[PDB]
Amino acid sequence: PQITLWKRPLVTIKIGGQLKEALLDTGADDTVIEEMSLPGRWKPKMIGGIGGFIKVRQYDQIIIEIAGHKAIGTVLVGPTPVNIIGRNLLTQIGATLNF
Amino acid sequence: PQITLWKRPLVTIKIGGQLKEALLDTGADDTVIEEMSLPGRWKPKMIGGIGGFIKVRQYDQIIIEIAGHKAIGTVLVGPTPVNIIGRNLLTQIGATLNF
Numbered sequence: 001p002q003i004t005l006w007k008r009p010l011v012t013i014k015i016g017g018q019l020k021e022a023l024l025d026t027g028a029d030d031t032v033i034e035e036m037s038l039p040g041r042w043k044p045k046m047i048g049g050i051g052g053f054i055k056v057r058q059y060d061q062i063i064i065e066i067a068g069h070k071a072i073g074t075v076l077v078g079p080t081p082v083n084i085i086g087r088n089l090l091t092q093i094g095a096t097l098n099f
Numbered sequence: 100p101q102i103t104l105w106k107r108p109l110v111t112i113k114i115g116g117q118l119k120e121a122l123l124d125t126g127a128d129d130t131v132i133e134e135m136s137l138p139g140r141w142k143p144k145m146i147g148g149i150g151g152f153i154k155v156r157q158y159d160q161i162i163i164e165i166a167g168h169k170a171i172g173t174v175l176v177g178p179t180p181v182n183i184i185g186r187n188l189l190t191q192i193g194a195t196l197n198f
């Protein structure tokens with residue numbers, strides 16, 4: 001698809017068999033999701049955004065579908081205000097910015 | 100241009116007679132620039148992201164040049180860690196996400 005930006009670029013994702021809404025976010029290096037259960041071990045990460053830092057749980061090699069496109073990669077889980085798909089997974093779905 | 104997302108999508112902007120580097124950010128509703136002076140009236144605003152809220156000054160009807168393309172809109176000025184070009188200005192340069 002070609003997504004214009006008059007509205008937020010919200011898509012449906014599927015992670016852990018569950019559908020969620022997330023924002024396609026070219027300003028995010030990494031994908032950050034709200035609290036949920038994922039399998040396996042996690043590693044710590046402190047990430048900084050507009051208002052300061054939050055602690056998140058880093059899960060690697062997680063199966064996630066984004067707007068129907070299959071990805072497998074890193075997901076950060078923590079107290080984000082919105083689910084954000086960052087460049088680590090936007091590159092997996094072949095996303096570019098165009099003007 | 101087509102901008103891939105292997106790296107942060109940084110561009111040069113001209114705002115208030117100044118050159119700055121800014122991120123093309125589909126996850127931002129509005130454009131948020133680090134502290135600088137702009138002319139005309141403003142009003143206070145609180146904006147929230149990862150890590151909470153910051154206080155900014157909202158300036159309306161500001162001309163920006165974004166990677167050589169002129170646009171006009173609202174610019175929020177305050178203690179952002181990164182200069183962000185949000186959707187309010189990305190739409191005006193005809194920016195789309197494509198996959």
Ligand SMILES: CC(C)CN(C[C@@H](O)[C@H](Cc1ccccc1)NC(=O)O[C@H]1[C@H]2CO[C@H]3OC[C@@H]1[C@H]3C2)S(=O)(=O)c1ccc(B(O)O)cc1
Pocket residue numbers: 023025026027028029030031032047048049050082084086124125126127128129130131146147148149180181183185
């Ligand atoms: C969160 C979004 C719903 C909204 N945001 C826009 C978003 O793209 C931000 C931009 C940014 C980049 C770096 C530092 C600070 C901000 N991305 C962000 O926080 O990314 C973080 C995390 C992802 O992986 C790494 O990449 C960078 C770091 C780091 C950890 S926003 O900036 O919070 C924002 C909120 C509100 C309004 B508004 O109301 O117009 C406008 C903007």
Ligand SMILES: [Cl-]
Pocket residue numbers: 072073074088089
């Ligand atoms: Cl990844």
Ligand SMILES: [Cl-]
Pocket residue numbers: 105106107
């Ligand atoms: Cl980079």
Ligand SMILES: [Cl-]
Pocket residue numbers: 171172173187188
């Ligand atoms: Cl605007």
Ligand SMILES: [Cl-]
Pocket residue numbers: 004193
């Ligand atoms: Cl359009």
Ligand code: NA
Pocket residue numbers: 138139140158159160161
């Ligand atoms: Na003004």
